[PDB]
Amino acid sequence: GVSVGKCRGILNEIKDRNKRDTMVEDLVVLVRGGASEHITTLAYQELPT
């Protein structure tokens, strides 16, 4: 009697994920006219109102 069994197995799997996001915001003011404390308080760089 002759009997011989052959079995071969192989597995492969790769998963990849990448995400990138950016957001930039700027605000510039320009005031000319006023010397009293009113323009000094208005010269606050920190809300455009």
Add this chain to the structure above:
Amino acid sequence: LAQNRSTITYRSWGRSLKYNPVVIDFEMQPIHEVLRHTSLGPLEAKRQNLR
């Protein structure tokens, strides 16, 4: 006000600038350029030497 980040300090900042104004920027010319504009008249030799 440098460490401060709010607009509440801006009033006192403007008041201090009123009391003690600092020099922000200024134009400049060489020191030998003012000798020509003196009442002493011609100073060409000294002006070139200083230049």
